[PDB]
Amino acid sequence: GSHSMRYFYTAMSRPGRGEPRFIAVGYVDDTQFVRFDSDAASPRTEPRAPWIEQEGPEYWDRNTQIFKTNTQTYRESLRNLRGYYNQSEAGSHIIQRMYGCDLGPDGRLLRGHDQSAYDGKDYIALNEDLSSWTAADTAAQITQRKWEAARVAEQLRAYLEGLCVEWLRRYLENGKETLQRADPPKTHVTHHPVSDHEATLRCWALGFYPAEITLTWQRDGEDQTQDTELVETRPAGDRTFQKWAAVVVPSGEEQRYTCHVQHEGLPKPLTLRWEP
Amino acid sequence: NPDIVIYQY
Amino acid sequence: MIQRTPKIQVYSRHPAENGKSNFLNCYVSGFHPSDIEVDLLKNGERIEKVEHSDLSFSKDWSFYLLYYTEFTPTEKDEYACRVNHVTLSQPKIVKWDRDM
């Protein structure tokens, strides 16, 4: 599983246009709680969720030192990777990092993660065993040799099993009312004529949290995946999410179609039809 | 809270 | 180098109701690299006050951003979101449709 914490780092070079930008954001499930941007007026770590604002100056100062050290480290790493790939000095490149812990319903660690990408492609990732690496190509094997010599994986296992779970459990308690309460979707089916012979049936899910959800259309109990337009789950802007699924149906056959909804906040799945 | 495992690639 | 086209959705925070204050959202996702230009439009012209979320990305490494502004839906006014990205030969405009 029911909870997780993730940090997302993005480092972007911009030759001829200044120093590389480093941004870090932190999430508990689908709630962002922290941000750091090296391009800010006076780069420092900022709160982004009410339940983190109570943390003292020691917390923000330690985070700022970690993110400032990372800013310099990713600038050097971008230069290293440009060389490993024999790339021109003219182009912009990006290193991304995503890491964190996943806790089951019992509050116990299910899985630890630490993944990196270069220009949108998997580069190096810590394996499930929390001790070995998967390096996607010859360049990433150079980073693998450095990280094995530095014993990076042992340090990451200690973080993921220890401080990551400790801090995730602390945030989950300080924000119990907004993080542990699953808001069930508000659902409804709308109908929109396409012509005199067809209509769109759109099944809506609004104001739900967490973002994970399944919306499907069936015709006489048969899945309509090929004929369904399913939009990506999108943020409403108030920490809740939205999603819809639509099917074009012959006019007069709407009763044969059902929308199926599965979400954490719904103990049993829903079956909805258009109700004129 | 983020980790302090900071190494160049 | 991987480059991915942005997916664009234009919608309101709350169900549209003419004359009632709401928020107009333009959600761009699934793109790479991160530089992207997003304009919220009111009758074909740029909206002055527009805010945006912090740059983050999904499990597949693609970026996403939310651009948002306060608005009041009316019968006469048309809204849209205009997006440009290195993967697009020209800007892509998606009109706001209250039924989507």
Author numbering:
A (entry chain A): 1 to 276
B (entry chain C): 1 to 9
C (entry chain B): 0 to 99
Authors' description from the paper:
8 The HLA‐I molecules present small peptides (8–10 residues), derived from pathogens or self‐proteins, on the cell surface. The peptides are bound in the HLA antigen–binding cleft into six major pockets designated A through F. 9 Peptides are anchored to the cleft by two main anchor residues, the second residue at position 2 (P2) and the last residue of the peptide (PΩ), that bind into the B and F pocket, respectively. Currently, the classification of the HLA‐B35 family into two groups (PY and Px), in the context of HIV‐I infection, is based on their binding preference at the F pocket to specific C‐terminal anchor residues of the peptide (PΩ). 8 The selective difference is attributed to an amino acid polymorphism in the HLA heavy chain 116, with a small serine or a larger phenylalanine/tyrosine in the PY and Px groups, respectively, changing the size of the F pocket.
We used the NY9 peptide (330NPDIVIYQY338) derived from HIV‐I reverse transcriptase as it is recognized by CD8+ T cells in HIV‐I–infected patients expressing HLA‐B35‐PY or HLA‐B35‐Px alleles. The data confirmed that the NY9 is a strong T‐cell epitope in HLA‐B*35:01+ HIV+–derived samples and an HIV epitope restricted to this HLA. HLA‐B*35:01‐NY9 (PY) exhibited the highest thermal stability with a Tm (thermal melting temperature) of ~56°C, while the HLA‐B*35:03 (Px) exhibited a Tm of ~38°C, which is very low compared with other HLA‐B35 complexes. The HLA‐B*35:01‐NY9 structure revealed a canonical orientation of the peptide in an extended conformation, with the main anchor residues P2‐Pro and P9‐Tyr binding to the B and F pocket, respectively. The central part of the NY9 peptide adopted a flat conformation in the cleft, and there was no secondary anchor residue that was seen before for HLA‐B*35:01. While the NY9 peptide adopted the same conformation when presented by HLA‐B*35:01 and HLA‐B*35:05 (root‐mean‐square deviation of 0.14 Å), it was different in HLA‐B*35:03 (root‐mean‐square deviation of 0.35 Å). Even though HLA‐B*35:01 and ‐B*35:03 only differ by one residue at the peptide‐binding site, this finding highlights the critical role of this residue at position 116 in the two groups (Px and PY) which seems to determine the preference for the PΩ of the peptide.
